[PDB]
Structures are given as structure tokens and as C-alpha cells.
């Protein structure tokens, strides 16, 4: 039982960590004049925070004690040099969000905790959609940036 | 891994196979002047195809490689002689569809694939409603067909 | 009689075969993150199926026996490497759909089957429009794919 | 008056018993694919429960202490084998609801309890309508059942 | 071409002759209290006469001289003794309407009369629909009339 409660708290920290990492991507894009990509990252930052809030609200109803941890400073931004590097780090953050949800579901399954498994279902499905979407933007970014200035089209036109 | 990817491909084929079986039922119904029952099978033909398309879409998102198989020819139509024969085959078909989804679910469960299991849930609930609905139509058809001509009312009225 | 009833029956198979080949093109484009082209292919997949159902409905009314045949596995997806390969196969598919309608119309003509010939007219005119449309897309695709990444703009903007 | 309070409590039990019996008739109809007759019995199960609730509410206002009794398991569904058996039990159930209301009215008349008698008047008139309606459905069912399949054809149309 | 002018005129006669047969059918139905089938025949009588007027109008524009012939007295009503007999005569009437359109189309094809062939196309397709519809009513009529009274119950609902 302690494992399930530890992993449920770690999931809150992970959603807030993701929210701050998206915010850091927004900043890098804005500073580098990619306002389209920056807006997208900003909206994602707010959505991850809403996921964290959704976990906190469920935990409070189900008497899972929550203790909020530090949200660590985003670290990938110091080394990003092009939009491709940012999008790659965001794909990896979403892959880590998915694994963290699957580990929680595993612990809930071992405990037979049917309510926690039910609560997690839409998040597992949303992660499928999100990794697919990011993977697809990253494919387009990597392809368009083979021609100088062309990626600048993606930002301005789409996003 | 392997068993799970293979069963997910097979589910796509099972949905499209069922689609064609429902089309073959519409045809038998139309050819034999049961327009109401033919409309109903035609709608279900479109629906099974949409179920297959939904599995393809999920597989593409989840990087489950799909390769489309041949869709087999329906075989039951040569033997159907009355509407009870057709609704009986359709009941068997939905039973096989449910079985298909359950085997896929068992595979996902052994792999701890929570995303695939969550994706399947609405389909397991839909199949309960579908087998019930077809079972129920089959019961009326079998009862009304005990009087010459009476079943034509079911078709025409509903 | 025999030749005509046979060709009519097989036109249904040709339309469903084309529906499955469009679906396979949609899958290849989705798996390679060309979502806009995948959506166009998925829509044609539905439309080819509606053509087949149009043939089946006419055959039922005209007492032409329909026996539904296996719908062959699509096979060009094994060797597609780029969007041009896919659109080229789709062009060939529609050229074959056209030839199969003209063969049918040729048999109806020989049979003096006026009703069947009238039934086919709008399909002949639709195949004109469809070959022109696919030929035009393929011309754009081939030209744009001369510069790396540029084709990825067609998909994102149009489609 | 002990007898008045006793009969008022028994009326509550009879309405909830009728509610459960109607629900058992819904279940037997549903299990045997008579969805229309099942919907009708389900609606009647809800209505009987509302009668019981209106007696509870009146008793609380009038200071008649209600003690809720067991609602017995419906047992006639063990023996129903056709819709005629079901409707016949339902006719007998409504005849019993009429008798229990008339017993209560007699006790209230004895006690000169004008408020209780005024409260019961709409239920007396409702029971007249209910018994007539169930008697009439039973006559239709019995008649249509003389021809195999004919009854089914009218579950489907009416109800 | 004399043959084409003759056949075009005969087509007008055939449409009005069909109109009168439909009227005769309506009458037999109304006299025997089949008001729904009678209404369907009256509707068809008016539609056949409209076909006839469409041929006349086209002939007038195309300078095909129309000489209106006697419309023969309908004779099948002499022998009808149930609805099946009427619907079978109506089927054979639409089969003969189809044949006469096909004879006309054949003469037009021989003369390379493209405008007449184009004019006939929707009639060919309409006759497919009509033979199907009447064939299907006749199958239902034949089947329901195997149980005494049952046919009546479905003039009353459908129609
Ligand atoms: Fe998240
Ligand atoms: Fe996210
Ligand atoms: Fe399905
Ligand atoms: Fe289904
Ligand atoms: Fe087509
Ligand atoms: Fe096409
Ligand atoms: Fe009551
Ligand atoms: Fe009642
Ligand atoms: Fe006509
Ligand atoms: Fe006509």
C-alpha cells in the first residue's frame, strides 16, 4: 500500500514537472521568435498543470495523503539550439509521463485498486494521443528544417 | 509484443469480415423483398467497418503496425432460406466478434497493456448490447414466423 | 445474360478492392505523419465503398445476382517509400477502375442493355474527374518534393 | 386508533411490494424479449413506489408513525411461462392493492378520520382506472395469443 | 425514320393505356374495400399519364408528329378476384411498359438518334425502380394473404 501512495504522489510532481518543462520550451521559443510553437507549449504547460490538479482532487476524495514536492528547475533549456532539440525533449517528457502512469497503474493493479485503475483509463488514452501528436510534429519539424528558413513557415502558417 | 500485435491485426480483419457478412445479409434480404431487414443489415455493415477504422486509427497512434489482410468472402448466404437463418448467422457472427475482442483483451491483460485495455472497454460494452439486440430480434422473428405471412408485418411495420 | 452479369458482379469487387487500397494509402501516410494526405485517402476509401454499394443496390433492383467475393489484400504498401510512390499507385488504381467501368459498359452495349448503360453514365464522368484530380495532386507532389521538406507544407496547409 | 395506524403501515408495504412485483414482471418480459411489455411494467414499478412515498409523506405530516417493513421477494416469476401468466398476476396484484386501500378507508371511516378519507379519494379513483386498464390489456393478450406469433407482433407495435 | 416516329407515338399510347389500367385497378380495390391499395393505384395512374405528357412534350419540341390513338378499355378487371391477381396484372403491365421503352431505345440506337436516347435514359432507370417496387409489393401481398385476414391488416397500416 505504501508503494501505491508514493507513486500517486510522485505522479502529481511529474505532471507539475512537465508543466514547468513546457513553460521552459515556451520561453526558449519566444526568445527565439517562434511565437507559434511558444503558444502551443504554453497551452500544454497549462494542461499538464490541470492533469496534476485532477490527481490532487482525486487523491483528496480517496484519502490518498498528498504532500507537494519541489518542482525541479527545467534543465533541457540550457542546451537547446534549434526547434528540433526542443521538440525532441518534449517527446521524451511525454514518454516519461506515460511510463509514470503505467507504473502507477501497475501498482494499482497489484493492490486490486479498481477505483484508481478506472480513474487512470482516460489518462492512458490521452497519453497515446499526445505521444502520437508530438511524434508527428517532431517528424514535420525535422523534415522542414532540411531547407533553410522553411521551418519558419510552419510556425507562422500553422500553430 | 508478438501475440498482442498479431491479435490487434486480426481484430481489424474480423471487423471488416463482419462488415461484409452484414452486407451479404442485406443482399439476401433485398433479393427476397425484406427491405426493412435489408436496411438494418446495411446500417450494421457500415458500423462494423467504422469499428475496424477505429482499431486502425488507434493502432497507428500506438505504433502497432497494421497490415491489411484480404477480407474473406461471406459464405453463409448460399445456405440461407428464410429470415430466421440469416438472423441466426448474424447472432453467431456477433458472438465471434465478442470472442475476438475478449481474446485481444486477455492478451493485453497478460502484457499489462493498460492503454489497449482502456481502449477496448466501450467495445466490450457495445458487444453486450449488440448480442442482446440481435438475440431479441431473432426471438421475435422465430415466433412471428410460426404464422404464414405474419413476419412480413415485422419488416413492413418496423 | 452471362458475361454482363459476371462483369457487374466483379465491378463490386473492383470498388471494394479500391476502397481497401485507399485505406492502405491512409495507413502508410498516418504512419509516416502525413495526416492531411491520410485524411484525403480515408475519405476516398469511404467513397469507393459507396460506389460498390451503389452497384449492389442497382443489381438487387435489376435482379442481377450478386455474390460477394474476397476483397484482396492491398500489396503496394510493401514497396511505398515516399508520398509520390503512394499517389502513383493511387493513379494506377483509378485508371484500372476506369477501364473496368468501360469494359462493363462495352458488355452492356453489346447486350443492348440500355438501363445498365444509363446507370454507368455518371460513373464514367466521375472517373474523368477523379483521374484528373489524382493526376494533378501527383504533379504537385512530384514538383514539391524536389526541395527537402517542402512537401511537408502541402500536407499541413492544403489537405 | 391502533388499527388505523396498522393499516396505514400495511398500505406502505403493499405499494412497495407491488413495486417489486412489477419490477419482476419487467425482468421476466425482458429476459424473454418482450421489451415493450417490460417498459410498461418498469414504469408501473416506479409509479407504485411513488404511491408508497405519497403515503409515507402524508403519514409524517399527520404524525402517523411509519415503520418500514420487509419488502418480500416476488415469487410468481418462478412459475410464469407466457405473457398471459404475467398479466394475470399483475391483475391479481392490482386487485390486492384495491383491497388494501378499501380496508384502510373502512378503518378511517370507523374512526371518523375525515382527513385520511379525503387523502384516499384520488387513490380509490386511480385504482378503478388501473384495474380497468390491466383487465383490458389481459383480454387483448389472451385473444391475440390464440394465433402463434401474433402477440409478439403487438408488443413491437403498441407499448 | 418512320419506325422511330411510329414507336414514339406508340409509347404515348402505352403510357395512357397503363394509366387507365391503374385506374381500373384502383376501382377494383375501392369496390372491395382495399382503400390503401386503391390510393396507391390512383397515384400511379396519374404518374403514368405524366409520363405520357412528357413524351408528348418532347415529341412536339423534336418535331415528331403525335397522333393520339384510342386508349383501350382495360379488360383484366373482368377476372381479378383477389388483390394478388391485381398486383400480378400491374407487374405484367410495367414489364410491358419496360419492353416498349426498350423497343423505342433500339430504334433510336439504330437511327443514331442521340437526343432520343438521352431523353429515354431516366425512364429506363425509373422502370428498373418500378419493376422492383411492384415485384416486392406482390411478394408481400402473396405471403400475407396465406393467413385469412392478414392482408387486410396491412392495406390498413402501410399504403
Ligand atoms: Fe500529463
Ligand atoms: Fe502532456
Ligand atoms: Fe464490430
Ligand atoms: Fe457488431
Ligand atoms: Fe469507384
Ligand atoms: Fe475512385
Ligand atoms: Fe398503488
Ligand atoms: Fe398500481
Ligand atoms: Fe410509364
Ligand atoms: Fe409506371
Amino acid at each position: 500500500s505504501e508503494e501505491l501512495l508514493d507513486l500517486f504522489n510522485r505522479q502529481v510532481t511529474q505532471e507539475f514537472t512537465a508543466s514547468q518543462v513546457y513553460l521552459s520550451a515556451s520561453i526558449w521559443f519566444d526568445q527565439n521568435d517562434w511565437e507559434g510553437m511558444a503558444a502551443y507549449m504554453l497551452a500544454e504547460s497549462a494542461e499538464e498543470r490541470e492533469h496534476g490538479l485532477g490527481f490532487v482532487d482525486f487523491a483528496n476524495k480517496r484519502n490518498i495523503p498528498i504532500e507537494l514536492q519541489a518542482v525541479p528547475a527545467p534543465v533541457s533549456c540550457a542546451e537547446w539550439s534549434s526547434p528540433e532539440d526542443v521538440w525532441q525533449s518534449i517527446l521524451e517528457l511525454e514518454q516519461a509521463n506515460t511510463r509514470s502512469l503505467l507504473n502507477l497503474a501497475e501498482a494499482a493493479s497489484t493492490c486490486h485498486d479498481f477505483a484508481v485503475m478506472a480513474f487512470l483509463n482516460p489518462f492512458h488514452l490521452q497519453q497515446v494521443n499526445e505521444e502520437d501528436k508530438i511524434g508527428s510534429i517532431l517528424a514535420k519539424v525535422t523534415d522542414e528544417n532540411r531547407t533553410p528558413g522553411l521551418l519558419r513557415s510552419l510556425d507562422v502558417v500553422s500553430f
Side-chain angles (χ1 to χ4, degrees), chain A:
Chain A
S1 180
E2 115 276 17
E3 204 215 1
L4 166 80
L5 305 157
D6 178 64
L7 289 181
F8 206 106
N9 269 264
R10 279 193 185 285
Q11 183 63 27
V12 174
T13 304
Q14 175 70 30
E15 301 293 343
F16 295 153
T17 292
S19 175
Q20 281 293 102
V21 166
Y22 273 116
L23 176 66
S24 80
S26 93
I27 285 160
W28 186 92
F29 281 137
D30 277 317
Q31 284 169 346
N32 294 282
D33 300 310
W34 297 93
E35 290 89 354
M37 291 173 193
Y40 176 97
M41 294 305 172
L42 193 66
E44 286 301 312
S45 181
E47 172 189 314
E48 295 288 359
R49 178 161 180 279
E50 292 299 318
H51 299 162
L53 299 178
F55 280 72
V56 161
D57 181 46
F58 185 81
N60 289 347
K61 300 189 299 195
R62 236 292 296 277
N63 307 123
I64 289 160
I66 287 302
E67 293 293 335
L68 294 176
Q69 313 184 301
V71 193
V75 223
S76 292
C77 172
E79 299 291 342
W80 288 336
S81 282
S82 60
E84 186 176 338
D85 296 336
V86 189
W87 288 101
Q88 176 63 43
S89 295
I90 292 306
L91 175 65
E92 291 170 13
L93 175 77
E94 294 287 358
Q95 292 167 343
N97 290 165
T98 297
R99 281 182 312 269
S100 69
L101 287 169
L102 291 174
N103 284 333
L104 184 52
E106 206 70 82
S109 182
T110 298
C111 293
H112 299 328
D113 193 322
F114 294 103
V116 175
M117 294 191 283
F119 173 68
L120 302 174
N121 292 154
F123 296 89
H124 294 128
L125 294 173
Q126 203 219 326
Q127 286 309 108
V128 176
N129 293 344
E130 282 273 12
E131 289 189 28
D132 176 68
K133 180 172 196 173
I134 288 170
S136 173
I137 295 171
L138 174 67
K140 297 167 182 31
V141 166
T142 196
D143 198 15
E144 289 194 14
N145 206 35
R146 297 164 62 197
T147 291
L150 179 63
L151 179 64
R152 207 61 92 160
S153 97
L154 191 55
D155 191 72
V156 172
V157 155
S158 312
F159 287 110

